[PDB]
């Protein structure tokens, strides 16, 4: 054939990949502490002899969007929201250290703090709270525990949440949705990120997802139009080859 | 066997028919959840390579093998499915629909081109027999 | 299941579940000692197609 069909076909398939990314972002429009994935087409030119006429296209996800989302006021002392450019630290699935923005902190029957089922990492390893005690979280992450039955004079600090500062260019979303330091950024900032004393959290507010609707809509419209365009070419090439095959006759 | 160009073009026709069959099978089973063994349907692909064993560089086309794609299978969340794993995820085929449609059309076009080649070669061989009346 | 009709179906189902939770909260306003429900969502495993 004329491999021009293999260019428009790639452009049509990567458009479906982009649509699958955008639809995934739209599905998580209500996920607490969600970071939308950025999608971008990139052109790769095929190198070789003769007129460099073929340039294929391949989707690309250049990190995520770090713009803070909405702050819903839920009058719950455990739901916290982070200052912009801030991250909470939890223990990842494989016993590693991961970063998140979901402040929906839950207390188990044994007293351990968890986020989405992952243990919360305190100044010194996971945080264990006295069993069945009221928890208040300060602006700088200090945790006060009140034991029921005892007077409010008993309120004393227990542990401090680890709050780190990381930009978009330094973190990469792992396969389980937890952000981790990129290789270059890890090599310069060390393996574990030191807690920043300047980070401020807000107790009683939960951060929503930063999925922008207007950009999503525009992206879907553009993707549909591009797919239809590539499909026109895929039809042009087909007919042209169908007719060109006649020269092989007589 | 098939003389020369006859063998070459017949090999090409058979290989392109196999490729189109693979594409049609992939298109049909793009939404299959399971197979007889309980494993997800993995997209199949043919392997084209030349067959010029008796000291030649060009000899036509033959399909060495049919191979299943290694592109990550699509995970869908479904905890009630008997085939779901520990996390509740079910594996679904990695078929590229647009890719298989383009494969169907391209296979048809090159199959037709080889048909035109074989027909022309027959014509020429038919005229040859009338060399000098 | 073209990987874009499944992803959006999942979002539609999630929004329907959230609406069911909201309707349950609103219907049980007059009950005694009722604690309101809140729906929490999490994204599933992201698939990596090609490494950076």
């Amino acid at each position: 054939m004329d491999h021009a069909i293999y260019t428009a076909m790639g452009a049509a398939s990567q458009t479906l990949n982009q649509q699958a990314v955008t639809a995934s972002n739209l599905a998580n429009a209500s996920t607490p502490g969600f970071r939308a994935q950025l999608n971008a087409l990139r052109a790769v030119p095929v190198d070789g002899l003769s007129l460099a006429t073929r340039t294929l296209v391949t989707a690309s996800t250049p990190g995520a969007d770090m713009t803070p989302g909405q702050l819903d006021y839920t009058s719950r002392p455990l739901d916290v929201a982070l200052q912009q450019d801030g991250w909470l630290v939890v223990q990842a699935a494989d016993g590693a250290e991961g970063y998140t923005r979901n402040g929906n902190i839950q207390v188990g029957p044994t007293g351990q703090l968890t986020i989405q089922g992952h243990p919360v990492i305190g100044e010194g390893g996971p945080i264990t709270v006295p069993e069945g005690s009221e928890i208040t979280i300060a602006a700088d992450g200090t945790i006060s525990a009140l034991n029921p039955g005892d007077p409010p004079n008993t309120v004393a600090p227990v542990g401090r949440l680890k709050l780190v500062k990381a930009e978009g260019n330094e973190v990469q979303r792992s396969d389980d949705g937890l952000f981790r330091l990129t290789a270059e950024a890890q090599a310069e900032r060390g393996a574990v990120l030191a807690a920043d004393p300047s980070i401020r959290i807000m107790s009683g507010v939960l951060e929503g997802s930063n999925v922008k609707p207007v950009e999503a809509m525009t992206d879907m419209i553009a993707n549909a139009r591009r797919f239809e365009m590539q499909m026109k070419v895929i039809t042009s090439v087909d007919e042209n080859e169908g007719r060109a095959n006649q020269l092989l006759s007589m | 066997a098939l003389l020369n160009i006859f063998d070459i073009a017949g090999s090409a026709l058979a290989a392109q028919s196999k490729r189109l069959n693979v594409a049609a099978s992939n298109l049909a089973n793009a939404d299959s959840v399971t197979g007889p063994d309980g494993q997800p349907y993995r997209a199949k692909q043919v392997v084209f390579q030349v067959d010029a064993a008796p000291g030649q560089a060009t000899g036509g086309v033959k399909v060495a093998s049919v191979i299943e794609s290694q592109a990550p299978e699509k995970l869908v969340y479904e905890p009630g499915n008997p085939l779901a794993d520990a996390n509740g995820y079910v594996k679904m085929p990695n078929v590229d629909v647009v890719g298989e449609m383009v494969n169907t059309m391209s296979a048809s076009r090159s199959y037709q081109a080889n048909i035109e080649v074989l027909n022309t070669v027959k014509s020429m061989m038919l005229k040859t027999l009338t060399l000098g009346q | 299941m073209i990987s874009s009709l499944w992803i959006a179906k999942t979002g539609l189902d999630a929004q329907q579940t959230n609406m069911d939770v909201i309707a349950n909260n609103l219907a049980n306003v007059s009950t005694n000692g009722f604690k309101r429900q809140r729906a929490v969502f999490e994204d599933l495993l992201y698939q990596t197609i090609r490494q950076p």
């Binding site: 294929l56 391949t58 | 692909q45 084209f48 030349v50 383009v102 391209s106 | -």
Partner: peptide
């Protein structure tokens, strides 16, 4: 000498 003739060889891939 050859490979998959179609979609799986005409798409960009990371190197090995």
């Amino acid at each position: 000498p050859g490979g998959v003739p179609g979609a799986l060889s005409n798409q960009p891939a990371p190197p090995n």
